[PDB]
Amino acid sequence: MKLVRFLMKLSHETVTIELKNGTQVHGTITGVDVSMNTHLKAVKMTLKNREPVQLETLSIRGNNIRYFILPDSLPLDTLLV
Amino acid sequence: PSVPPRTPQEYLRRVQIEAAQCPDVVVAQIDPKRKQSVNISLSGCQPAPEGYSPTLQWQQQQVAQFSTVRQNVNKHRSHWKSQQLDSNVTMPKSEDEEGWKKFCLGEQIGFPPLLSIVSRMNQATVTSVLEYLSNWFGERDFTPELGRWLYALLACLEKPLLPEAHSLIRQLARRCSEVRLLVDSKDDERVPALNLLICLVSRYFDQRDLADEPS
Amino acid sequence: DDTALIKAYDKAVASFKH
Amino acid sequence: KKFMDKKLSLKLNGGRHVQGILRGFDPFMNLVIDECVEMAGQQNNIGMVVIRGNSIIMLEA
Amino acid sequence: LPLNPKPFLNGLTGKPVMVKLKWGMEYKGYLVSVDGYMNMQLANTEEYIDGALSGHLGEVLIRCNNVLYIRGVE
Amino acid sequence: MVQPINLIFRYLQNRSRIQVWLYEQVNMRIEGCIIGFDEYMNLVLDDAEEIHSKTKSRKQLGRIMLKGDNITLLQSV
Amino acid sequence: PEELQKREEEEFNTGPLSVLTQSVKNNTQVLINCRNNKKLLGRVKAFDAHCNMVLENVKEMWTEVKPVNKDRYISKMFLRGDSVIVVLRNPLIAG
Known part of the structure; x- marks a missing residue:
C-alpha cells in the first residue's frame, strides 16, 4: 500500500501523464486518491491528430493512466518514506 | 471431516485450510542457460571535442532566454496570424516534404521564419517540417538559415510533446553532436549553433541524457 | 517585429564566447 | 436489483450481446442465465450459463 | 481427487511451462519461482507471438494479472 | 435462486466439460473439464482446448490453470 | 501483527519480485514490456506487490513505419503495475 502512499504526497507538483490512449496530459496535481484517481x-x-487543449482543471481515473512523468527536481529518496 | 463438501462455502473453506498448508512462495533451484535477443538502443550525443563543451552557466542562461522567447511567441500568436504577404508565400501543403525544403531553404533563396509565417503553423505541421529539416540536415551541410528555422520551429513546439516529437528532436540533437566532431576551429560558424540546439533539446525539452555536461 | 525569432537566434549564437 | 425470472438481452464487453432468462444473482453482481442465445450473423443455443459482474456493458429487458 | 489452483501451480515449479497472456503472446520457460498473488518467474524464457518464436529473454518476471492460463509442457 | 458459485460447484461435482468466454479476447474460447477452483474463481481444467471462433480449430493444452479475472461467461458442453 | 509485514520483504528478496529488488539493491537496469507497446529500460527505485513502480533514467523505446527505431528519455516516472506485461532481469542492449 506503499507506492500509492508516495503518490499521494505529490500535490502542488506538476507532471505529465500518458493516458492509455497515448494522450499526454501536462498539469499540476491538486490531489491523488487511494486508487490513483488524479485531479x-x-x-x-x-493529442495525436489535433491541436492541444488548455483547461482550468481536469480529473483522470487511476485506471486510465499508463504512467506519471515526474519532475526531475522531485526528491525521491526523501519521499520514499 | 472425510466426506466430500456439500456447499461451495464448505469447499472454499477447505481449499483455504489447504492453502495455508502450502508454502506461500516457492523457489525451484534449477541447473544449467543460453544466448538472448539484443534490444537495439540509440546512441546518446557525442561529447564535444575538448574545449568545445559550453559551460553550465551558458547553457542555463540560454534556456532561460528561450523560455521568454516562447512566452512571447505564443503571447502574440493571434496578432501575426492575421496579416499576409503575397502569391509569394504559399505555405506548402502540410505533407509536401520537397516544397517545404524549397520553401524554407530554396536552392528561390528561401523564406526566413517570420512570426507572420510560423504563427500560422499548426502543431502537426511544425512537427512535420522539423522532420523535413532534420532529413535535409543529414544529407546537407548545416547553414545558418537552417539554424534559424530549427530554432524557430523549436520555439513553436508546445508542451507537453508527443513522444514522436521527443524522438525527433533527440535525433536532431544527435546529428548536431556528430557534425560537431567534424569541426576544427572554435572559430567555426556551426559551433555556437550546434551547441545551442543541443542545449535546448537536452535542457529545455527534458532529454537531459543528451546534455553536454562539462568536465 | 516580424523577424524577432531570427533576432533571438542571432542573439544566442552570438551569446557564445569561449 | 429486483428483476427475476424476467427475460433480459445483455450487452457484454468486446461487442457481444446475449439474450436469455435470469434465474439468480450475486452480491458481486455476477449472474446466472438460462435458455440463452448468442447473437453474432445468425444465432444458436447455449442454455444455462454464468456471467461475470463486469463484462456486462448494458442490461435491458 | 480435486486438484486446486495454488497446489497445481506449486506443482509446476522446476519445470517447463507455457504461460499465455491475456493479449495473445506466450512465454515458455522454466518456472523458477511463484508467489502469493501468482506472479511468476521464468528462466530460459522464449516468447511466441502468433505462433512465431519472437525472442530469447532469459530471466523474466510476469505480473500475475496478465496471465490467461499456464500449463505444463514436456 | 441459484447463486452462480453453486452452478460452478455443480460443474465441479459432475466434472462437466465447460466453455469459457474470455474478457480480453473474442477470437478464442477455452474448453476443458473442471477439476478445481478457488475464491477468486481460478480454475484448474483438464483436457483443455483453445477453440478459435470462425477458423473452427482446436488446440490441445492438456491440464491448465485458468485465471478467474479472465471470465466473461461460463457455459456447458 | 504488523511485524508480519517482515514476510513481504523476505518474500520480495526471493520469489519472482526478486527481479525488481535486484535492481533496487544493486542499481541495475531492467527492461520492461509495456502495454503502450513500447519498452522501458530503467532502474527500479521502489515497487509494491502489484508492480507499481518508481523508475529512474528511463529510456522509452519503440519502432514505427522499413521500421525505424525511436526513443525518448524520462528522468523519473511512476509506472502503474497494470501497464507492465513482463520484466527482464538483466536485459541485453546494444547500439
Whole structure:
C-alpha cells in the first residue's frame, strides 16, 4: 500500500501523464486518491491528430493512466518514506 | 471431516485450510542457460571535442532566454496570424516534404521564419517540417538559415510533446553532436549553433541524457 | 517585429564566447 | 436489483450481446442465465450459463 | 481427487511451462519461482507471438494479472 | 435462486466439460473439464482446448490453470 | 501483527519480485514490456506487490513505419503495475 502512499504526497507538483490512449496530459496535481484517481489544474493536453487543449482543471481515473512523468527536481529518496 | 463438501462455502473453506498448508512462495533451484535477443538502443550525443563543451552557466542562461522567447511567441500568436504577404508565400501543403525544403531553404533563396509565417503553423505541421529539416540536415551541410528555422520551429513546439516529437528532436540533437566532431576551429560558424540546439533539446525539452555536461 | 525569432537566434549564437 | 425470472438481452464487453432468462444473482453482481442465445450473423443455443459482474456493458429487458 | 489452483501451480515449479497472456503472446520457460498473488518467474524464457518464436529473454518476471492460463509442457 | 458459485460447484461435482468466454479476447474460447477452483474463481481444467471462433480449430493444452479475472461467461458442453 | 509485514520483504528478496529488488539493491537496469507497446529500460527505485513502480533514467523505446527505431528519455516516472506485461532481469542492449 506503499507506492500509492508516495503518490499521494505529490500535490502542488506538476507532471505529465500518458493516458492509455497515448494522450499526454501536462498539469499540476491538486490531489491523488487511494486508487490513483488524479485531479489536476492548469492543464495542457497534447493529442495525436489535433491541436492541444488548455483547461482550468481536469480529473483522470487511476485506471486510465499508463504512467506519471515526474519532475526531475522531485526528491525521491526523501519521499520514499 | 472425510466426506466430500456439500456447499461451495464448505469447499472454499477447505481449499483455504489447504492453502495455508502450502508454502506461500516457492523457489525451484534449477541447473544449467543460453544466448538472448539484443534490444537495439540509440546512441546518446557525442561529447564535444575538448574545449568545445559550453559551460553550465551558458547553457542555463540560454534556456532561460528561450523560455521568454516562447512566452512571447505564443503571447502574440493571434496578432501575426492575421496579416499576409503575397502569391509569394504559399505555405506548402502540410505533407509536401520537397516544397517545404524549397520553401524554407530554396536552392528561390528561401523564406526566413517570420512570426507572420510560423504563427500560422499548426502543431502537426511544425512537427512535420522539423522532420523535413532534420532529413535535409543529414544529407546537407548545416547553414545558418537552417539554424534559424530549427530554432524557430523549436520555439513553436508546445508542451507537453508527443513522444514522436521527443524522438525527433533527440535525433536532431544527435546529428548536431556528430557534425560537431567534424569541426576544427572554435572559430567555426556551426559551433555556437550546434551547441545551442543541443542545449535546448537536452535542457529545455527534458532529454537531459543528451546534455553536454562539462568536465 | 516580424523577424524577432531570427533576432533571438542571432542573439544566442552570438551569446557564445569561449 | 429486483428483476427475476424476467427475460433480459445483455450487452457484454468486446461487442457481444446475449439474450436469455435470469434465474439468480450475486452480491458481486455476477449472474446466472438460462435458455440463452448468442447473437453474432445468425444465432444458436447455449442454455444455462454464468456471467461475470463486469463484462456486462448494458442490461435491458 | 480435486486438484486446486495454488497446489497445481506449486506443482509446476522446476519445470517447463507455457504461460499465455491475456493479449495473445506466450512465454515458455522454466518456472523458477511463484508467489502469493501468482506472479511468476521464468528462466530460459522464449516468447511466441502468433505462433512465431519472437525472442530469447532469459530471466523474466510476469505480473500475475496478465496471465490467461499456464500449463505444463514436456 | 441459484447463486452462480453453486452452478460452478455443480460443474465441479459432475466434472462437466465447460466453455469459457474470455474478457480480453473474442477470437478464442477455452474448453476443458473442471477439476478445481478457488475464491477468486481460478480454475484448474483438464483436457483443455483453445477453440478459435470462425477458423473452427482446436488446440490441445492438456491440464491448465485458468485465471478467474479472465471470465466473461461460463457455459456447458 | 504488523511485524508480519517482515514476510513481504523476505518474500520480495526471493520469489519472482526478486527481479525488481535486484535492481533496487544493486542499481541495475531492467527492461520492461509495456502495454503502450513500447519498452522501458530503467532502474527500479521502489515497487509494491502489484508492480507499481518508481523508475529512474528511463529510456522509452519503440519502432514505427522499413521500421525505424525511436526513443525518448524520462528522468523519473511512476509506472502503474497494470501497464507492465513482463520484466527482464538483466536485459541485453546494444547500439
